[PDB]
Amino acid sequence: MTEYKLVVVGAGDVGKSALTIQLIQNHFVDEYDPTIEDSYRKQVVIDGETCLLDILDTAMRDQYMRTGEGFLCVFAINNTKSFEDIHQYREQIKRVKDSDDVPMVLVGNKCDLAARTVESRQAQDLARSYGIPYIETSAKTRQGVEDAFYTLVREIRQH
Ligand SMILES: Nc1nc2c(ncn2[C@@H]2O[C@H](COP(=O)(O)OP(=O)(O)NP(=O)(O)O)[C@@H](O)[C@H]2O)c(=O)[nH]1
Ligand SMILES: [Ca+2]
Ligand SMILES: [Mg+2]
């Protein structure tokens, strides 16, 4: 079966682990729940293709990073700095992959919140400038979580 190596990156506490554990185990990380594990493997069927997903939940990180085939770049919609950090995460990925054209989706997480400081349009516009999809997610409600990871798999297949 086909394999996909996915890497989840982003600033602290944006929800990298929550998104990954929600996709892998269908439960929501809260305050004091374990996010010590950094790697996850899951067999899933995606558009009729049985897929083996390796997911690296980032906190020898560079050797792991270089092997990623696609990247979820995550910020939280109530964390302006995490959104401003995205450009640096993308630049790092581009350098370690040695490519201007890496499968990537921009994820705006925590879209369940009743107040936000990062507007959807400005994330939409940044993603357009990168040529990549933008998906708003909630690891809490599961909204868009499968959409984000599967869209990333589809971007890797398009590559
Ligand atoms: N309301 C809400 N809170 C969320 C959501 N996703 C994560 N959180 C909360 O945000 C905090 C950090 O989540 P976590 O997944 O650990 O983030 P992280 O990016 O893995 N942090 P770290 O860099 O420490 O690995 C936790 O309190 C978690 O419950 C979400 O979609 N909605
Ligand atoms: Ca293999
Ligand atoms: Mg984490």
Token duo for residue 114: 């009743």
Query: What are phi and psi for residue 147, nearest 5 degrees?
Result: -55, -45
Residue 59 CB–ligand 1 contact under 6 Å: yes
- The DSSP code for 11 is S
Tell me the domains of the chain and their CATH numbers.
1-159 (3.40.50.300)
Q: How many helices (H) and strands (E) does the chain have?
A: 6, 6
CB proximity list for 50: less than 8 A, separation 6 or greater: 1, 2, 43, 44
Q: What is the resolution of this structure in A?
A: 1.9
Say if CB 67 and CB 54 are below 8 A apart.
no
SS (H, E, C) 80-93: HHHHHCHHHHHHHH
Pocket test for ligand 1, best of 14, 36, 141 (most atoms within 8 A of CB): 14
**Burial (CB count within 10 angstroms: exposed 0-12, middle 13-18, buried 19+), residue 54:** middle
Instruction: HSE, CB side, 13 Å, CA atoms: give it for residue 67.
Output: 11
Closest ligand to residue 14's CA: 1
**Burial (CB count within 10 angstroms: exposed 0-12, middle 13-18, buried 19+), residue 44:** middle
Q: Which residue's C-alpha comes closest to atom 2 of ligand 1?
A: 110
**To 5 degrees, how large is the angle CA 19–CA 23–CA 26?**
105
